[PDB]
């Protein structure tokens, strides 16, 4: 069976893992996948996630299976964070989420459902994009087509090609967006066209799948969720896959949400048990523990204000390192005006790098980057500022 | 998109958990899922995996993501507690295997893996089986035929006609068996049929899938794994499911595993990289907490040595209620000879019921078996014997 099966491409942000650790030599740089780290180089398990284990611990009886979609208190919450306090979909009983796990794990069964249920052929998404988009996708059955987004040159989001692209996508198809921190570019539209996005839209037939893995690395929680939140207003349907891997540092015990709207309560729950059986035929139920400390949580109200400050301290050290990047480069030889990458949010800095630069930054200099140009800004610290400035000086 | 979307069948088995918490009546006697229950009812977590719990979460420095394929130690216990200690694919580095999110999980990754890569187009599945099994290979995109097994008057398994529906079984087809504790049956094969069956399939040419859900409940860890360990030594190439839902009570934590062996090192490792292709485009890496727990436990003598009595402690607890059921029974009115469930391994009783008496000990007795007649016997406690045997008699 197995004789001729010939060994897959390493997973271009997923592969540099593996090398990194095999690479022995003392001074190296990681900078390649999104995940934060401190002053200290670290990732620590937030206090707050800690207490709320400590908790758990003292506090479960049974570890007896969780219903398809998982724990409600966890949906009802993640439907709050996303939609507003008082909202009409909530009211009127207009959405329900499924747990599942990671956001990747959303995206699926997002693809799965659609697949199965409804007569999708496409799915349009950004150019650049997360890789791995058109890989879950396409596992699913369904095509990959893209919408230009992002000029080079004046390091801008291209608005009017935006629209252009997408004038071809047909009614009925799926328009992936970042709800905010684009990954890899940094780059979301303003709320004026956002509007002029949520517009289009009904005008045209899309459906919405709205992508968040980086809820208030942007502004703030509530400030990057109005651009889903101006959709939600002029539309009936809509799919959006969200995840608590980033902003609780909870990585790897795998915790989203997909959360399904349609026109009315009726509708929502006819699919939503359509979206359950393609669960059930794929992992059975979602892991317990993530996401039974995510709820805690947002239930307690001293654990939720410790939650939210040591979400606003990582905003703030990205913030700092993004500045001193760019002073750094300057200091040290930079060739090229830079300056453009203080105006972009979240994790990222596409930093323009070509692939063979980013190939001898590796293998000469042993700093890790994406080969899009992509680096993890929370990556940086005071300590290897200087180190890898001189580094890319050097490849420029 | 969503206005023709009609509303999916529920599940068989998940369904009446719903059924079962909307009843409100008292005395009502669940029966239904195979989750362990103790002398009192409940489902107590684990002494051994709270003490398990309990060190993690002192000693955890990180929630940073895991590999595709998870933690190794993980894999390399799960190799030993199916193969054996000094085996030859151990030896050979013939096996790889990946975390997955429980046995389900397990079993769609496989799916996957095998539609995408290989000419597979049937699996081959017992009659009767676990009812997701078809759902799970559909999905993938593969056709699910029977084989007959056990033959209902005498209450065995019928070997003959086992063999002859399989000789239409092609060679390139995937046939499932169960290791031990057949799920629904509780009929497994004594080891010189597995041994007349490792041989067939050599001679037919099948890939043989192993499923595990049970290992230890039945006459013990070793004892149970004696069928699979008759195929490895004969087999170039086959693939496991194993599930720790069960014999570790980490139901809701998802923690399984998918091990694929070939017939050297580099053949496993050019297929497996394929294997951990389809997981990176489903969820993207496994949860951590469950599978911390397995070889934290596995790893230390004396935590390992407190999981081995409470397994025993559940297997003889399903025996001795095994047998009370069949007295009680006889004592109560019971107008069959039902001996032929103590001969029968595992968490279940194929009862023999028709559908319209499983239906009626529902509406009227509140006492919920699944449709086939399968029914949990370690639900049953000293408490509620004598009420649930009144209400089948009532019933015959
Ligand atoms: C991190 C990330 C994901 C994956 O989220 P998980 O929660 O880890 O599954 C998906 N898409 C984007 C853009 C991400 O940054
Ligand atoms: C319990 C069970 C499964 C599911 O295992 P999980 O580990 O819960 O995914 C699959 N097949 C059979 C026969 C089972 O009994």
Redesign the interface.
């Known amino acids: 069976?197995?004789?001729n099966?010939?060994?897959?491409?390493a997973?271009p942000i997923?592969g540099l893992?593996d090398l990194f650790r095999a690479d022995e030599r003392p001074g190296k740089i990681n900078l390649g996948?999104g995940?934060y780290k401190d002053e200290t180089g670290?990732?620590?398990?937030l206090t707050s996630?800690?207490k709320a284990?400590?908790y758990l611990?003292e506090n479960?009886?049974?570890?007896?299976?969780?219903?398809?979609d998982g724990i409600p208190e966890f949906g009802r919450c993640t439907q709050e964070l996303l939609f507003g306090k008082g909202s009409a979909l909530i009211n009127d009983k207009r959405a329900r989420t499924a747990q599942?796990?990671?956001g990747?794990?959303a995206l699926?069964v997002a693809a799965?459902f659609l697949a199965?249920?409804?007569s999708?052929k496409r799915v349009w998404v950004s150019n650049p994009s997360w890789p791995?988009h058109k890989?879950?996708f396409?596992?699913a059955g369904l095509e990959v087509r893209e919408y230009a987004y992002y000029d080079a040159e004046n390091h801008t989001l291209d608005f009017d090609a935006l629209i252009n692209s997408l004038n071809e996508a047909q009614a009925?198809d799926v328009v992936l967006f970042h709800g905010c921190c684009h990954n890899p570019t940094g780059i979301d539209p303003t709320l004026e066209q956002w509007q002029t996005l949520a517009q289009l839209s009904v005008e045209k037939g899309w459906?919405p799948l709205f992508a968040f893995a980086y809820q208030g690395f942007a502004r703030g929680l509530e400030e990057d969720a109005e651009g889903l939140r101006a959709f939600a207003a002029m539309h009936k349907?809509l799919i959006v896959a969200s995840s608590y891997?980033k902003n609780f540092?909870?990585?790897?015990?795998?915790v989203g949400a997909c959360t399904l709207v349609?026109?009315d309560s009726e509708?929502?729950?006819?699919?939503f048990?359509?979206m359950?059986?393609?669960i059930?035929?794929?992992?059975?139920?979602?892991?317990?523990?993530?996401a039974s400390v995510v709820a805690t949580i947002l239930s307690n109200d001293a654990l939720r204000a410790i939650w939210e400050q040591e979400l606003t301290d990582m905003r703030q050290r990205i913030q700092r390192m993004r500045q001193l990047f760019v002073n750094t480069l300057q200091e040290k030889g930079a060739n090229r005006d830079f300056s453009f990458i203080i105006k972009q949010n979240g994790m990222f800095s596409f930093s323009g790098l070509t692939k063979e630069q980013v190939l001898r930054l590796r293998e000469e200099f042993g700093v890790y980057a994406v080969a899009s140009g992509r680096v993890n800004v929370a990556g940086m610290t005071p300590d290897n500022m200087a180190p890898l400035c001189e580094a890319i000086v050097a490849v420029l």
């Open positions: 069976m197995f004789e099966i010939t060994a897959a491409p997973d997923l893992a996948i995940v670290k990732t620590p398990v996630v800690k284990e400590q611990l479960e009886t049974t570890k007896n299976y969780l219903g398809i599942t796990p990671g990747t794990g699926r799965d199965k249920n409804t999708v791995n890989s879950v396409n596992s009925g459906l349907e891997s540092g909870l990585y790897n015990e795998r349609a026109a509708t929502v729950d006819r699919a048990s359509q359950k059986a393609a059930r035929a794929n992992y059975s139920n979602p892991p317990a523990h993530g």
